[PDB]
Write a structure and sequence with these properties.
The structure is cut from a larger assembly and holds eight protein chains of eight kinds.
Chain B (H helix, E strand, L loop, with lengths): L16 H12 L3 E5 L3 E7 L13 E5 L2 E7 L1 H22 L5 H17 L8 E9 L2 E7 L5 E3 L2 E4 L3 H15 L6 H12 L13 E7 L2 E6 L9
Antiparallel strand pairs in B: 1-2, 1-8, 2-9, 3-4, 4-5, 5-6, 6-7, 9-10
Helix pairs in contact in B: 2-3, 4-5
Chain G lengths: L5 E3 L2 E6 L2 E7 L2 E3 L2 E4 L5 E3 L4 E8 H19 L13 H17 L6 E8 L5 E7 L4 E3 L2 E3 L2 H10 L14 H18 L6 E8 L3 E9 L20
Antiparallel strand pairs in G: 1-4, 1-7, 2-3, 2-11, 3-12, 4-5, 6-7, 7-8, 8-9, 9-10, 12-13
Helix pairs in contact in G: 3-4
Chain H lengths: L13 H11 L4 E5 L4 E6 L15 E5 L2 E7 L4 H19 L5 H12 L12 E9 L3 E7 L5 E3 L2 E4 L3 H11 L6 H15 L9 E7 L3 E4 L2 H16 L2
Antiparallel strand pairs in H: 1-2, 1-8, 2-9, 3-4, 4-5, 5-6, 6-7, 9-10
Helix pairs in contact in H: 2-3, 4-5, 5-6
Classes of the chains: A alpha+beta (222), B alpha+beta (231), C alpha+beta (195), D alpha+beta (211), E alpha+beta (244), F alpha+beta (240), G alpha+beta (233), H alpha+beta (235).
The structure holds ligand 39V and magnesium ion (MG).
The site of magnesium ion has 6 residues of chain A, from loops.
């Protein structure tokens, strides 16, 4: 019997800063125990200062991104070159996904950018369109490996202030882009060690008011 | 006379009067000029207002990053035809990862307009279009008529009093074709061309509309204080 | 839903219907009224799959109310029961059938007679002196076979009905949270608020 | 999920948890399971998140159009029915959506339970989700019509807490709403970790747990 | 295109009339007269066949009176072919109702249905209307004995006594004169025939130029019988009433 | 399908088919609507050219759309049945989807929308019918009276008349009906409705039909004798 | 939904400094039966592109006809059909990728794995994969079926990353491809000795080599192997 | 007869031009745009004194940030309004935001030329669409049955349009307040109306960023009418 779905592995990671956002993802593409590509871009600049990644079944992911990029193009045509806000993009993507509620795009999607007040924004989706704005989100194969680390190191969960002994929490001080990129690189290095579908390369897309910037880092190829 | 009731009827001399009447709507429309060099292509359009309280009707429409047009006649028909071009330019990109050739865009418009001239019930399009674009064979300018006839040109003009601008371009042919790597000078030649079609009124800041596309220049429209430089 | 009973006495029809509604392992409601008035002298109780029951009942209600307005006339219980049967018989061969069993209790003003019709989800109609759907009849029909007379009063009908509910409450494993009882006679439809 | 909602003297209380699961994995610590349809209408969410979000967001579109056509706000009864009718179109197609439509209209406060089977029930108290049984225990033994706004808010809060503790698929935080005739009023996000220890000490409950 | 040849059958005149309906009524005015008379104990239907021949097989012929079901019958005035289209539709509606409700269709409901079909042809579809006027004779247990008429406009009305087809103006005046409310079937039979005998364009009214029918509770006990008269039976009633 | 555009604009900006539909309404029998302080009354003319009529079974001029709303009309009788049916279906459809009966304003807006649709749809002609739609909204004691016409426009009226010689009875209503103090009782409301028809009707015998609609689904049709008593009292006061 | 009947095995390919190489054997298998021995599974499109196809042959012949029709259609009203507006490898791939993903979305896939190899207008190497699921990816080396498991490891020793492409000559690349084809003949039970090889170079254009054979095979050591454990004779 | 989508020898669609004549017969509607808001006002024109004038609804809400006035065959406007409301709320569903006034107008105007032998004829009604959005601020559009729409600083449509438009030509300036605009609409309405203007036969409305679209009470308008009379008597 024909199986229309597949699993191309990979892992993605979005973190929202005070006035910036990052969306990262490994560049490895796989089927079963084989490597298709060591460098196959997975995170895309979709225009209007928005970055997007649909991780899981690559065919469905590429189709979704292609369709959303197309939605942005037609938004400009239909609404006098108005900029598509990150909240408006998120709602648009919900409808793209739920339109195939009974034959789902088999992907976990994440977009990142800046809200209309200039603050960093990440939005996270499920395969059938349910979404919400979040501060931190890892998606894909090693999502369960990475998310707890981020609960601990980004939102300071289970961390208290010494001497008080569990009475006073660690205060939620904001993170700089340099600090976030460290947590991203350590997150992927750790995921690469313990997950066979993660490796080869890491590509990070950083979003600020100045635009979209890219950073690439090597990962273990085993 | 007896043979102008619908588009499905030839006259005794082999004329299609409904198509000719649709052609008449273009002559009533405001003037628009098109011209190109080897590097860039430029549209210049005289916008028309209803009165002093009203805005100036937009004339230029973007179809893709590398293609767009200016209109003269029934504006809603231009919206339909430009929407069709947007879809066709987009079908070429999504399916073939290919920017639609300006010549092929003209062929598609011709064939769309033609179907309306041979069938009962419908009507011809009541608008003329000047399509500019930059593709793999350089800069291009097309003139569309709702009879179906599409023509590739160095320069042209359509609308009321368009003959004056068309004569100017016919003289200036050898000069403006050579304006390579100089967008501002090519626009100047277009603004000077459209000026030959003006009477009583002159080019003001909210009157003039300009668009350009080229080698390293996406299709962009200039309105308002952005065209004060060229007045 | 679970249990719906019906009994036709001398001059009225009495319908008793359970109050429970269950989702998963939790009883969400213990005061549900599993019935719709189709016309002033015609009442329909229902039981079957979740959702389908109310949708079907309301759809029937709307159609009879439309007939009443159009003709300025109340359809006989027999006519209504035949309409309902055809809709269920039509439904059973549909893509997704409506899984609903009904009792129709009505008082025919022309003949001056009470009438009770039992119709299952297949479109199986029978006129009866007393009726039930599902497992309800397994416990109650022996009592009704024994005690039922056609010349019974409304009060005797209610007493025989109380005996039926008591037997159900004793020998059924499920808690159906008592019943709402309604009486259909020449004067119309009224609910017995204490049962 | 666990969600609950109940009518009382001073309107209706609505309380939900904030967890989301993908098997044993807790996929979200803080999801919003209440939708603000309009200033006087709320909707709770339980089941498939996508279904809950899509159809209740669409319900809000349809309730807004009602206001534009009629120049009056939609009733809670009508709003619940529009939603139950949406469920009946996708009857058997595999949706999963359990919700309470809470609000205040001309008949006073209203509360309707609606699920994917097209069920539509009116009542004074409801609770949906994997942890509804735990919530019902507290609600049933403590509920009165004569509750004060302060005591009612606490009951809804404490009932979710009970469920969050025992139900593995309920937790994260508690979101409280109070619906009045001037509209709904949000009463905050309450972390269950902190709330548990607080309630344990102040109430003396959860004696078996060590803290 | 095709527009050139469209007569536009469904339009108003400047005066607010429907051309085709008015012209259809003009057609019907040349058709053989049909009369219906309602009595307390039954209904009479009498109708005149149009200029017949001696070689027409009368006993097997039917152009005027048709049976819709056991309780309802109609008299036709206009195009017979058009009438048969409508009659077969009405026969189906009556059976659809019987299947649905397990009761015989009330007369008015059947009449309204046929009249709604006629109406549709005057408002949409661009087709010519049916050039037919019906007299409906029927019985049901709500209103008892009932007479109705419908015409190409799709408008219907109830009557105690009525005529359609030719010379309705003259026929209605004669009926209005001699009709009384306490009248009986045997008296109504006589009135119907006498009216036709005076209004007819023929020289003399004979059995071979008539179709006749009665709907009586003159059936054994509480039930209704339809009687489509045979040629010999029409001959006998003509002698009985003293016309031939 | 038959798609022919029958209702179209003329050079002077008129849709003749819609205007000729109004002429069909002008031909129709007179209908009148008067709302009192706690009621609405609908009066209707019956032309006495048709005797030997069976009044038991003949279609009545006033039609119930629901238990709380009624509809009378002037114009083509066959056309009116189609609007009435559609209205009755929409009334049950509203109860089924929204769980409230239609408001009088909503029902009017629907019927008016149907009439409008038949003025710019292909292959169809406009309804040769104007309607008076009256009743009381659920749990409301304020009277409602609306009018519709072939074009599809509708509006609310304190009192209104349509049909043949409606110009005359409207003239009567305009001088006799006071807005500051409307017919306080049912009697006064019916009396004013009968008086208005007596300007046009001819004989006050079986030519006048009256239907009184009161709040909370209280609708009754007056009989011949009841109306005849109003006719008697009016003329006896007039002899002075 | 179907099952593949007549099938072609591995298609292998790689980039080198001035272009791309692609290869595939000439066998059409019918299950374990080696039915058809003269099947061409590399299909040139113009003089700048070669499409290599594995999987169901009937679907391959269908795709072959779509490409033939694509060339015809591109020439229509196109004075620059053999110049600026000629078909690019990227156009051909995207078309096929669109078709493949549409067909899988209708639950009626073309049961194939396809590699489009070619050189673009600007001289850039093009090498991209697509299959019955509509899944696409690009890499310095690409291979289908068994080739993915056995050829890629060998080809990746020559070009391990992007920076190794300019350092790899056509002689070294062809040598690696030919060795890979030999290894596949040793170890793939649905492979044949006969194969075809195509080189698309930005300077020398399209070179299409037919009737190639696997040679220099090692079998002599087999004579010494006796029994399955304890047997000496 | 002749096609519905036929061109005249001058290059105009007969039916579109004829619908414009129907709009000239309609009751007057005026719109004035300012930096403090956009004002919409209409002539009700009741055919009889028994007609309850408050049921005349010629000013209509499309969304909280968009209002609409009509003139001509007002029955034709109902389907246009329904489409506008649906388009406005549907865009809010898809994009979680208010829709631009221009985009809403463009959606309404797309219906216009969908006629032939789709609906059988063009609409016999013109619309003044007024609203506010964050990108282009306060806006006033004039939507015709031709499918064309012009933006206006001030515009009058209906029977007294050319007389009112000439008056709007002189009176409008870029520094008008909301109060000044209100009186100006009342002034010009009073000038072109047959009957004497009062709170019962004329209606005002406005759209502001803060409060959104509001139809004015008869008591509120009555005061503005009284304020107008006094300031005209002041010189
Ligand atoms: C309980 C917390 C779960 O038992 C409750 O029922 C919630 C309700 C809820 C409502 C709105 C938003 C989120 C949750 N349900 C879920 O958490 C469901 C449970 C479920 C899993 N499979 C399934 C379920 C229910 C019915 C059929 C099948 N969880 C989900 O729907 C899963 C698919 N959701 C996610 O994974 C989400 C992710 C990731 C995510 C979401 C939802 C929202 C925002 C960002 C990311
Ligand atoms: Mg690894």
């Amino acid at each position: 019997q024909f199986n229309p779905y597949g699993d191309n592995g990979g892992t993605i990671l979005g973190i929202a800063g005070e006035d910036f956002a990052v969306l990262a993802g490994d560049t490895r593409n796989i089927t079963d125990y084989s490597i298709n590509s060591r460098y196959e871009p997975k995170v895309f600049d979709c225009g209007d200062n928005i970055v997007m990644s649909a991780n899981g079944f690559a065919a469905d992911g590429d189709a979704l991104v292609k369709r959303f990029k197309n939605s942005v193009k037609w938004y400009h045509f239909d609404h006098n070159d108005k900029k598509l806000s990150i909240n408006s993009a998120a709602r648009n993507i919900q409808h793209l996904l739920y339109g195939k509620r009974f034959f789902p795009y088999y992907v976990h999607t994440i977009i990142a950018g800046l809200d209309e007040d200039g603050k960093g924004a990440v939005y996270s989706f499920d395969p059938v369109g349910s979404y919400e704005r979040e501060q931190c989100r890892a998606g894909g194969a090693a999502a369960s490996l990475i998310m707890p680390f981020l609960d601990n190191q980004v939102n300071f969960k289970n961390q208290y202030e010494p001497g008080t002994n569990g009475k006073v929490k660690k205060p939620l001080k904001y993170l700089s882009v340099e600090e976030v990129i460290k947590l991203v690189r350590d997150s992927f290095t750790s995921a690469t060690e313990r997950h066979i579908q993660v490796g080869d390369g890491l590509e990070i897309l950083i979003v600020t008011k100045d635009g979209v910037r890219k950073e690439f880092y090597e990962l273990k190829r085993d | 006379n007896n043979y102008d009731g619908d588009t499905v009827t030839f006259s005794p001399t082999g004329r299609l009067f409904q198509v000719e009447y649709a052609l008449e709507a273009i002559k009533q429309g405001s003037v628009t000029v098109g011209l190109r060099s080897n590097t860039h292509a430029v549209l210049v359009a005289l916008k028309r207002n209803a009165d002093e309280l009203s805005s100036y009707q937009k004339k230029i429409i973007k179809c893709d990053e590398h293609m767009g047009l200016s209109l003269a006649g029934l504006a809603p028909d231009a919206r339909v035809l430009s929407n069709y071009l947007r879809q066709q330019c987009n079908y070429s990109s999504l399916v073939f990862n290919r920017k639609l050739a300006v010549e092929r865009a003209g062929h598609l418009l011709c064939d769309k307009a033609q179907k309306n001239t041979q069938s009962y019930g419908g009507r011809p399009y009541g608008v003329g279009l000047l399509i500019i674009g930059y593709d793999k064979s350089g800069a291009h300018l097309l003139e569309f008529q709702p009879s179906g006839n599409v023509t590739e040109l160095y320069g042209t003009a359509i609308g009321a009093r368009s003959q004056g601008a068309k004569t100017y371009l016919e003289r200036t042919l050898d000069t403006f074709i050579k304006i390579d790597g100089n967008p501002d000078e090519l626009i100047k030649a277009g603004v000077e061309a459209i000026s030959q079609s003006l009477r009583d009124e002159s080019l003001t800041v909210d009157n003039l509309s300009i668009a350009i596309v080229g080698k390293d220049t996406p299709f962009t429209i200039y309105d308002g204080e952005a065209v004060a430089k060229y007045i | 839903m679970d249990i719906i009973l019906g009994i036709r006495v001398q001059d009225s029809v009495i319908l008793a219907s359970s109050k429970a509604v269950t989702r998963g392992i939790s009883v969400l409601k213990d005061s549900d009224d599993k019935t719709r008035q189709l016309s002033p002298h015609t009442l329909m109780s229902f039981a079957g799959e979740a959702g389908d029951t109310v949708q079907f009942a309301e759809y029937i209600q709307a159609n009879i109310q439309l007939y009443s307005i159009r003709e300025d006339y109340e359809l006989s219980p027999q006519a209504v029961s035949s309409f309902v049967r055809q809709e269920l018989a039509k439904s059973i061969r549909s893509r997704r059938p409506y899984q609903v069993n009904v009792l129709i209790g009505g008082y025919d003003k022309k003949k001056n007679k009470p009438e009770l019709y039992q119709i299952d989800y297949l479109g199986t109609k029978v006129e009866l002196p007393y009726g039930a759907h599902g497992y309800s009849g397994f416990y109650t029909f022996s009592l009704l076979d024994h005690h039922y007379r056609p010349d019974m009063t409304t009060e005797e009908g209610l007493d025989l009905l109380k005996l039926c509910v008591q037997e159900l409450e004793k020998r059924m494993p499920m808690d159906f949270k008592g019943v709402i009882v309604k009486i259909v006679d020449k004067d119309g439809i009224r609910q017995v608020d204490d049962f | 999920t666990t969600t609950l909602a109940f009518k009382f003297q001073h309107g209706v209380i609505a309380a939900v948890d904030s967890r989301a699961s993908a098997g044993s994995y807790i996929s979200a610590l803080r999801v919003n399971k209440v939708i603000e349809i309009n200033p006087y209408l709320l909707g709770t969410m339980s089941g498939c998140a996508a279904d809950c979000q899509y159809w209740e967001t669409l319900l809000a579109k349809e309730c807004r159009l009602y206001y534009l056509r009629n120049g009056e706000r939609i009733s809670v009864s009508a709003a619940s029915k529009l939603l139950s009718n949406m469920m009946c179109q996708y009857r058997g197609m595999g949706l999963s959506m359990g919700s309470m439509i809470c609000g205040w209209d001309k008949k006073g406060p209203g509360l309707y339970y609606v699920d994917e089977h097209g069920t539509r029930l009116s009542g004074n108290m409801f609770s949906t989700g994997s942890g509804n049984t735990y919530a019902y225990g507290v609600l049933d033994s403590n509920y009165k019509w004569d509750l004060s706004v302060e005591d009612a808010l606490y009951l809804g809060k404490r009932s979710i807490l009970a469920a969050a503790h025992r139900d593995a698929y309920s937790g994260g935080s508690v979101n409280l709403y109070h619906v009045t005739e001037d509209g709904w009023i949000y009463h905050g996000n309450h972390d269950v970790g902190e709330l548990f220890w607080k309630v344990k000490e102040e109430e003396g409950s959860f004696n078996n747990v060590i803290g | 295109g095709s527009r050139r040849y469209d007569s536009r059958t469904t339009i108003f005149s400047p005066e607010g009339r429907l051309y085709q309906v008015e012209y259809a009524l003009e057609s019907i005015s040349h058709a053989g007269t049909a009369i219906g008379i309602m009595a307390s104990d039954g209904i009479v239907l009498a109708a005149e066949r149009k200029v017949t021949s001696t070689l027409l097989e009368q006993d097997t012929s039917t152009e005027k009176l048709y049976k819709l079901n056991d309780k309802i019958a109609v008299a036709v005035a206009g195009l017979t072919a058009d009438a048969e289209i409508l009659i077969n539709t009405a026969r189906i509606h009556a059976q659809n109702y019987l299947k649905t409700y397990n009761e015989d269709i009330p007369v008015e409901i059947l009449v309204r249905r046929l009249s709604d079909i006629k109406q549709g042809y005057t408002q949409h579809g661009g087709l010519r209307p049916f050039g037919v006027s019906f007299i409906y004779a029927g019985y049901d247990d709500r209103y008892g004995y009932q007479l109705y008429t419908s015409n190409p406009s799709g408008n219907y009305t109830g009557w105690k006594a009525i005529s359609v087809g030719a010379n309705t103006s003259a026929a209605q005046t004669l009926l209005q004169m001699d009709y009384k409310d306490d009248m009986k079937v045997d008296d109504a039979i006589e009135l119907a025939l006498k009216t036709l005998s005076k209004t007819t364009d023929s020289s003399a009214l004979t059995y071979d130029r008539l179709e006749f029918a009665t709907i009586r509770k003159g059936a054994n006990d509480g039930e209704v019988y339809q009687k489509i008269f045979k040629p010999q039976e029409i001959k006998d009633i003509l002698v009985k009433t003293g016309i031939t | 399908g038959y798609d022919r555009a029958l209702s179209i604009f003329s050079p002077d900006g008129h849709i003749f088919q819609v205007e000729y539909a109004l002429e069909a309404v002008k031909r129709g029998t007179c209908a009148v609507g008067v709302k009192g302080k706690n009621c609405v009354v609908l009066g209707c003319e019956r032309r006495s050219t048709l005797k030997l009529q069976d009044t038991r079974i003949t279609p009545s001029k006033v039609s119930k759309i629901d238990s709380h709303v009624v509809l009378s009309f002037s114009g083509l009788n066959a056309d009116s049945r189609i609007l009435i049916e559609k209205a009755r279906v929409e009334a049950q459809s509203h109860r089924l989807t929204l769980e409230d009966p239609v408001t009088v304003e909503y029902l009017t807006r629907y019927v008016a929308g149907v009439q409008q649709r038949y003025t710019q749809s292909g292959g169809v002609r406009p309804f040769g019918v104007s309607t008076l739609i009256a009743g009381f909204d659920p749990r409301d004691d304020e009277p409602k009276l609306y009018q519709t016409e072939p074009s599809g426009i509708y509006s609310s009226w304190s009192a209104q008349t349509i049909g043949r010689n409606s110009k005359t009875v409207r003239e009567f209503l305009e001088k006799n009906y006071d807005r500051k103090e409307p017919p306080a009782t049912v009697e006064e409301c019916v009396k004013l409705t009968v008086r208005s028809l007596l300007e046009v009707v001819q004989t006050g015998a079986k030519n006048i039909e009256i239907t009184v609609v009161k709040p909370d689904s209280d609708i009754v049709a007056l009989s011949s004798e009841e109306i005849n008593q109003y006719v008697t009292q009016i003329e006896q006061e007039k002899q002075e | 939904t179907q099952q593949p009947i007549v099938t072609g095995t591995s298609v292998i390919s790689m980039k080198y400094d001035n272009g791309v190489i692609i290869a595939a054997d000439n066998l059409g298998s019918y299950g374990s039966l080696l039915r058809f021995n003269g099947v061409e599974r590399l299909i040139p499109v113009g003089d700048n592109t070669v499409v290599g196809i594995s999987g169901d042959i009937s679907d391959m012949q269908h795709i072959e006809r779509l490409l033939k029709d694509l060339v015809t259609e591109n020439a229509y009203d196109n004075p620059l059909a053999d110049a600026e507006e000629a078909l690019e490898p990227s156009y051909i791939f995207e078309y096929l990728a669109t078709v493949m993903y549409q067909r899988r979305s209708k639950m009626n896939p073309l049961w194939n794995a396809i590699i489009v190899a070619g050189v673009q207008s600007n001289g850039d190497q093009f090498l991209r994969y697509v299959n019955l699921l509509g899944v696409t990816y690009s890499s310095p080396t690409l291979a289908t079926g068994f080739g993915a498991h056995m050829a890629n490891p060998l080809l990746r020793k020559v070009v391990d990353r992007e920076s190794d492409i300019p350092k790899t000559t056509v002689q070294v690349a062809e040598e690696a491809i030919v060795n890979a084809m030999r290894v596949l003949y040793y170890r793939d039970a649905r492979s044949s000795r006969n194969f075809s090889l195509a080189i698309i170079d930005k300077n020398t254009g399209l070179t299409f080599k037919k009737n190639l054979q696997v040679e220099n095979m090692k079998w002599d050591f087999a004579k010494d192997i006796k029994g399955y454990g304890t047997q000496k004779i | 007869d002749r096609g519905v989508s036929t061109f005249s020898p001058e290059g105009r669609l007969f039916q579109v031009e004829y619908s414009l004549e129907a709009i000239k017969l309609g009751s007057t509607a005026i719109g004035i745009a300012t930096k403090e808001g956009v004002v919409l006002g209409v002539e009700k024109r009741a055919t009889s004194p028994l007609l309850e004038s408050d049921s005349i609804e010629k000013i209509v809400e499309i969304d909280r940030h968009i209002g609409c006035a009509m003139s001509g065959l007002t029955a034709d406007a109902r389907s246009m309004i329904e489409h506008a409301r649906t388009a406005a709320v549907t865009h809010n569903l898809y994009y979680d935001e208010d829709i631009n006034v221009e985009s809403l107008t463009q959606s309404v105007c797309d219906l216009a030329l969908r006629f032939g032998e789709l609906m059988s004829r063009p609409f016999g009604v013109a619309l003044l669409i007024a609203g506010h959005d964050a990108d282009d601020g306060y806006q006033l559009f004039h939507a015709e049955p031709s499918g064309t729409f012009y933006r206006y600083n001030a515009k009058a449509i209906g029977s007294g349009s050319e007389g009112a438009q000439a008056e709007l030509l002189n009176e409008w300036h870029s520094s008008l307040t909301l109060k000044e605009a209100e009186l100006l609409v009342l002034k010009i309405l009073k000038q072109v109306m047959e009957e004497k203007l009062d709170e019962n036969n004329a209606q005002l409305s406005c759209i502001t960023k803060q409060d959104g679209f509001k139809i004015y009470d008869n008591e509120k308008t009555a005061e503005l009418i009284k304020e107008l009379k006094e300031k005209e008597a002041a010189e």
